[PDB]
Amino acid sequence: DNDPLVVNTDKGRIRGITVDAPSGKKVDVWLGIPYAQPPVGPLRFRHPRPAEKWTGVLNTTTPPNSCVQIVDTVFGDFPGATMWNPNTPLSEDCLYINVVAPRPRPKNAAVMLWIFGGGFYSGTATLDVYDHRALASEENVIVVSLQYRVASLGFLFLGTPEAPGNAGLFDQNLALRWVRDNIHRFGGDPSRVTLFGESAGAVSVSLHLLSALSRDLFQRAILQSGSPTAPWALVSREEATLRALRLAEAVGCPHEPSKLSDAVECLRGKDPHVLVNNEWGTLGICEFPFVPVVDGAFLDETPQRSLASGRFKKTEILTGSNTEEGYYFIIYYLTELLRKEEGVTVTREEFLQAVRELNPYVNGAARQAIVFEYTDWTEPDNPNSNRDALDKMVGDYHFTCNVNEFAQRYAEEGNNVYMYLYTHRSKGNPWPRWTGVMHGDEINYVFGEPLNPTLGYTEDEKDFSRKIMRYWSNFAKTGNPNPNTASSEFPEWPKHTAHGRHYLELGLNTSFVGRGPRLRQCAFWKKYLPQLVAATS
């Protein structure tokens, strides 16, 4: 074949299609390249098998199925809630990759691989927000995305080999090995693969930096609002087995800890949709029913012990938090208070009740430590203050501080870190104004969604998008986000060093460099509060 759009992968030939980006610039896309045997029937819960080789030319030309998950119907057809909802048909047969190359096609260029996040229970590579075409065209990078199994279908653990856990991670791993073996034919460099993800995607990206198996499969990592040391990232395998048996019971299957073989077999028989819909029960804020576990294969120790011993890939890291990480999660959980409407406020009575519900595992001397740390003492009863106080305590404990820890441990092991604090509200944000810059607002801007002429992004926001797209891209290219010739419209990004802890604020009219961010609160959660609960128990 002399036809550029056909590519001969290790398992067969595939045909892509030439499409315009929203920006107008033309790119070459390959949608739904199968990288694994569909994990159906006997293969459910288990690790993926490589794809069977196919005879002829396969048209990899249609956005692939998204994996079986719940749909967010709590706010109805609210555009802020539905943008995260899967936009393709749901199927167990969902293990597919997407490749987008720029035109003119490069001979050998950087590869930016996007692992999506949804708290390991939801998400798809096919979301309209993850605009591959805009990033690939504007930065000259091969943009790659993968679909991995999610929820119980991707992370069920029972201790047995028929449910060994981390299926979704081995899905990602296998997909990385595919990129290694094939990305050169699309014009990428199998040695310059940069993994980048948000939330559970960032947790995944970080787990690949830790993992023994996916170690030599990529070069660099960008981690948006996530780290492997986060509370929700992993569960004890003692708990994971219980969550699984409680799900077995909930769907009407044998749930005896002795006959675990009876459990998996029955579970393999049930409909995937009823399976993913009965996972939720008594769960606190920011804790998800089925997530990664320390299995022995992908991870043989907790991320804590991995970070401590310094056992992680020696590479550059770009990482950062948003200003209001918590709000999003405090809206869904704790729904009666803090509802979806403008100008909502929290009383001192309600704040005191919330810290009890948002931290239901601390003895009470610790709750007082929290109420003191997360209260504005210049005006202790202020209704706005007591609301924003809730966002910070959730945002710090579950997100911002875990990101900080990871970045710091990489920094003192002698690796170049680049820390950001994303502080920009989109002018047409559908959410109430009090939410501010929430969890995963940067995603639109990193994917060049403002450049879409059919959308109402301002001229300033279009610059800001191109700005952070460059930062991200040439980090994936060079290992450093700064321009080679040191520009002024592109401010400097100091290295997040162990002793200095410097971060760059990402907003419209700023080049501000701070330290942390939020150092006092992180020391509260990491240093002070643990030794208090020890002293009071």
Q: Are 348 and 387 in contact (CB under 8 A)?
A: no
Q: What is the footprint of ligand [N+] within residues 208-247 (CB under 6 A)?
A: none
- Quick note: the x/- pattern for a copy of itself over 500-529, rule CB under 8 A, is -x-------------xx--xx-xxx--xx-
* Residue 440 contacts ligand [N+] per CB under 6 A: yes
Q: What residue has token string 């927000």?
A: 129
Of the candidate spans 157-165, 213-221, 288-296, 372-380, the one that interacts with a copy of itself by CB under 8 A turns out to be 372-380
For residues 254 and 514, which CB has a smaller minimum distance to a copy of itself in the complex? 514
* Residue 531 contacts a copy of itself per CB under 8 A: yes
What are the structure tokens assigned to 392, written together?
């910070």
> 105 contacts which partner out of a copy of itself, ligand [N+], none, CB within 5 to 8 A by kind?
none
Q: What b/e readout covers 111-144, taking b as 16+ CB neighbours within 10 angstroms? A: bbbbbbbbbbbbbbbbbeebbbbbbbbbbebbbb
The single residue among 368, 458, 487, 510 that binds a copy of itself, judged by CB under 8 A, is 368
CA dihedral 264, 269, 274, 280 (to 10 degrees): -10
Going along 73-120, which residue ranges are E strands? Answer: 96-102, 109-115
Catalytic residue flag (residue 325): yes
Among the options 92, 198, 324, 325, which is catalytic? 325
Beta carbon of residue 512, minimum distance to a copy of itself (angstroms, whole number): 15
Query: Distance (Å, rounded) from C-alpha 466 to C-alpha 487?
Result: 14
Query: Distance (Å, rounded) from C-alpha 513 to C-alpha 377?
Result: 26
∠309-193-116 over CA atoms, to 5°? 80
Q: Which residues pair with 8 in a beta bridge?
A: 13
**Rg for the chain, CA atoms, rounded:** 23
For residues 84 and 410, which CB has a smaller minimum distance to ligand [N+] in the complex? 84
* Residue 86 contacts ligand [N+] per CB under 6 A: no
For residues 84 and 114, which CB has a smaller minimum distance to ligand [N+] in the complex? 84
Beta carbon of residue 523, minimum distance to a copy of itself (angstroms, whole number): 4
CA distances 151 to 73, 117, 170, 354, Å, are: 17, 12, 14, 28
220-224 and 188-198 strand pairing: parallel
* Residue 84 contacts ligand [N+] per CB under 6 A: yes
Helix %, strand %, coil % of the chain (to 5): 35, 15, 50
The single residue among 66, 137, 199, 211 that binds ligand [N+], judged by CB under 6 A, is 199
> 440 contacts which partner out of ligand [N+], a copy of itself, none, CB within 5 to 8 A by kind?
ligand [N+]
Q: Which helix (H) or strand (E) holds 317?
A: strand 317-322
Nearest to 133 by CA among 149, 147, 145: 145
Beta carbon of residue 284, minimum distance to ligand [N+] (angstroms, whole number): 19
What are the structure tokens assigned to 305, written together?
């012990």
Find the residue with minimal CB distance to ligand [N+].
Answer: 440
* Residue 536 contacts a copy of itself per CB under 8 A: yes
Beta carbon of residue 199, minimum distance to ligand [N+] (angstroms, whole number): 5
* Residue 314 contacts a copy of itself per CB under 8 A: no
Q: What is the footprint of ligand [N+] within residues 93-152 (CB under 6 A)?
A: 118
* Residue 397 contacts a copy of itself per CB under 8 A: no
Q: Are 161 and 42 in contact (CB under 8 A)?
A: no
Catalytic residue flag (residue 204): no
> 199 contacts which partner out of ligand [N+], a copy of itself, none, CB within 5 to 8 A by kind?
ligand [N+]
Beta carbon of residue 491, minimum distance to a copy of itself (angstroms, whole number): 22
Residues 6 or more apart from 535 whose CB is under 8 A from it? none
* Residue 197 contacts ligand [N+] per CB under 6 A: no
- Residues at the contact surface with ligand [N+], assessed by CB under 6 A: 84, 118, 199, 440
Chain contacts with a copy of itself (rule: CB under 8 A)? 364-365, 368-369, 372, 375, 377-380, 499, 501, 515-516, 519-520, 522-524, 527-528, 531-532, 535-536
Q: Could you give the residue numbers annotated as active site?
A: 199, 325, 439
